[PDB]
Amino acid sequence: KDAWEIPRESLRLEVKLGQGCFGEVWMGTWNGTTRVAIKTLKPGTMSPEAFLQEAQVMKKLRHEKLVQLYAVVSEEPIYIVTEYMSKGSLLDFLKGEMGKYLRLPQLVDMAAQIASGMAYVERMNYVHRDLRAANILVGENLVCKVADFPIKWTAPEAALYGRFTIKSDVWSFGILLTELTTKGRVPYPGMVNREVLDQVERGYRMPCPPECPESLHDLMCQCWRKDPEERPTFEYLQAFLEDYFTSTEPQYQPGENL
Amino acid sequence: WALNMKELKLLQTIGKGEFGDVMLGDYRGNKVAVKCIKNDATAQAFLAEASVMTQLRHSNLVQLLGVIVEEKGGLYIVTEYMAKGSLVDYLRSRGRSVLGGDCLLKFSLDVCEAMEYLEGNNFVHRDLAARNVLVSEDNVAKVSDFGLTKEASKLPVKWTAPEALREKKFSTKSDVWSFGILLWEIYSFGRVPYPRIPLKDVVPRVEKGYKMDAPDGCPPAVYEVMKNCWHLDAAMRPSFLQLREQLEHIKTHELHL
C-alpha cells in the first residue's frame, strides 16, 4: 500500500454522524489534531475492491470543491479518512435552522462553487453519476464541496438507456438548482417516479419556483434540454453564476424568501 | 424574391427575441428559417431588412431566400436554415473540451471575411456579436440579423464602440470594435462580455481605458487582435482586410496552437 496509508491508531472515531447500508460515518481526529470525517465499510455489504474504487478516483482528483481524501486503511476493517465538512449535507443545512435565512445571493454563490467543482470533474473527463444536494457537503463560510434510486435528479437518457455523461450530470445540476432555490424540496413535488419519467418524456419541466428570478429558470431549462450535446458546460454554468448579480440581475431586491 | 405562404409551413419557434421572432419552417420541402420583426407598425424595419438582404451575397452572410407578405399583415423574411444555432450556444454547448484552436480561429476568419465583404460594399452591421452569428450543419459561421445594417451612417452597449453610443453616426470602425468584442466571446466560449462589472460602469470604465482580460488559454496573438480592435481612437483601429491578414498571419505560423 501507499504512504496514503496511515496507522489505524492515529484515527480517533469520536461522534457518529450517520449510518446507512454501506457502513457508517464519523467525526474524529487523525494523528494528534486535524478534524476528519471517517467513512467505513461493513464487512457484510460489498467487497474490498468495491468500496476501494472511491479511493482509486478520490486519490487522482484534487479540486477546491471536491471533498479531499486525506488517507485510507485498505486491509479490512476499512476506514476512508477525508476532510471534515461541518454543516452536513446541503439538504440538511438548507433544509434545517440556517436554511430559512439564505437568500438568492447566497444560494447562487453555493451553486457557482458546485459548478466550479463539476467543471474540474469536467476537465479531467470524469463523470459523477449522482449529482444532487445530498451528495454536496457544506462547511464554514457557506463553502460547498462536491464528493463522496434517484430517477428525479437523473437525465432521461441515463434514467432509461443508461448513458451517463457529463452532460447528463448537467441535467442533475439543473434539478439541484431547484433544490437550492426552494431550500431542500424534492423536485417535481407530489409526483412519484413513473410520472416524472412519463412527463419529462412528453416534454414537461419544473416551473419556476416561488420568487425565483426568471434568469435562474432559463438556465435550469438550459440544463434540461432533451438533446444532451446542447446543455451548457459546467464552465459556462460556473461563470454565469459567478457574475449573476452584475450581468444578469443587477437590479435584484431581496423578497419574502429569496 | 416573393414567396408564397401556401408553400410555407411554420413548424416551431426557434427563438422569441426582443426585436423579432425566428421559426423553423418547411418551404417546398426544405427546412427554412422564418423571421418576423416586432414593433414595426409601418413595416419599414421589415422593408429595410429585406431590401438590404437582397443586396448581400457572400458565403459568410446568412442568405435571403425570399419574402412573404400576407395582405392581412403577416410579414416574414425567409432565410436559409442554419442547423447549429447561434455561435454563442454552439460554443457553450460543445465547449473547450471539443473545440480546438483551429476551430476557433476558423470561426474568426469566417466572421472576419463576412465583415470585410460588408465594409467593401459600404455597409455597417452595427450589431455584430456571437449571438448574431449562426453556424451551418457543416460548421460554417455566418453573420446574420441585418436589421441595423445601413450604409456608412438601439445598439447593444456591451458590443458597441464608445464613439458609436455617443456620436449619432456609426462607422466600420465601430464594427471593428464589435469584432474585437466578438473574438473575446469566441475564445471565452460564449461567456458574456465584461464579466465582473456593472452594466452601468462599462462605458465609463472602458473610456477610462479599461479592457477585458485575455480569456483563459487565449493565444497572445489573438488577444492582440482584440486589443487592436479596442483602441479608443477609432481611426487607429484596423481595417477588416488588415484583420484578415493578421488572423491569416497567425494561422500561417500556427501562433494559435
Swiss-Prot record, chain A:
Impact after mutating residue 223 to A: Significant reduction in S-nitrosylation
Active site: 130
Binding-site list for ATP: 17-25, 39
Modified residues (Phosphotyrosine): 161
Tissue: Expressed to high levels, and with a high degree of kinase activity, in certain fully differentiated cells such as neurons, platelets and macrophages. Isoform 1 is widely expressed. Isoform 2 is expressed only in the muscle.
Function: Non-receptor protein tyrosine kinase which is activated following engagement of many different classes of cellular receptors including immune response receptors, integrins and other adhesion receptors, receptor protein tyrosine kinases, G protein-coupled receptors as well as cytokine receptors. Participates in signaling pathways that control a diverse spectrum of biological activities including gene transcription, immune response, cell adhesion, cell cycle progression, apoptosis, migration, and transformation.
Annotated protein name in UniProt: Proto-oncogene tyrosine-protein kinase Src
Organism: Gallus gallus (Chicken)
Part of the full-length chain shown: 260 to 523 of 533
Curated annotation (Swiss-Prot), chain B:
Catalysis: reaction(s): L-tyrosyl-[protein] + ATP = O-phospho-L-tyrosyl-[protein] + ADP + H(+)
Post-translational modification as stated in the protein's UniProt record: Phosphorylated at Ser-171 by PKA, leading to increased activity. Autophosphorylated.
GO molecular function, one term: protein tyrosine kinase binding
Modified sites of kind Phosphoserine: 171
Keyword Manganese on entry: yes
Subcellular locations according to the entry: Cytoplasm; Cell membrane
Biological processes per GO annotation: adaptive immune response; adherens junction organization; cellular response to peptide hormone stimulus; intracellular signal transduction; negative regulation of bone resorption; negative regulation of cell population proliferation; negative regulation of ERK1 and ERK2 cascade; negative regulation of Golgi to plasma membrane protein transport
Entry annotated with the keyword NADP: no
Location of the active site: 127
Cofactor: Mg(2+); Mn(2+)
Tissue occurrence: Expressed in lung and macrophages.
Family of the protein in this entry: Belongs to the protein kinase superfamily. Tyr protein kinase family. CSK subfamily.
Domain remarks: The architecture of this protein is similar to that of Src-family kinases (SFKs) with one N-terminal SH3 domain, one SH2 domain, and a C-terminal kinase domain.
Subunit structure: Homodimer (via SH3-domain). Interacts with PTPN22. Interacts with phosphorylated SIT1, PAG1, LIME1 and TGFB1I1; these interactions serve to recruit CSK to the membrane where it can phosphorylate and inhibit Src-family kinases. Interacts with SRCIN1. Interacts with RHOH. Interacts (via SH2 domain) with SCIMP; this interaction is dependent on phosphorylation of SCIMP 'Tyr-107'. Interacts (via SH2 domain) with PRAG1 (when phosphorylated at 'Tyr-391'); this interaction prevents translocation of CSK from the cytoplasm to the membrane leading to increased activity of CSK. Interacts with LRRK1.
Known role: Non-receptor tyrosine-protein kinase that plays an important role in the regulation of cell growth, differentiation, migration and immune response. Phosphorylates tyrosine residues located in the C-terminal tails of Src-family kinases (SFKs) including LCK, SRC, HCK, FYN, LYN, CSK or YES1. Upon tail phosphorylation, Src-family members engage in intramolecular interactions between the phosphotyrosine tail and the SH2 domain that result in an inactive conformation.
Name this polypeptide is given: Tyrosine-protein kinase CSK
Parent sequence residues shown: 188 to 450 of 450
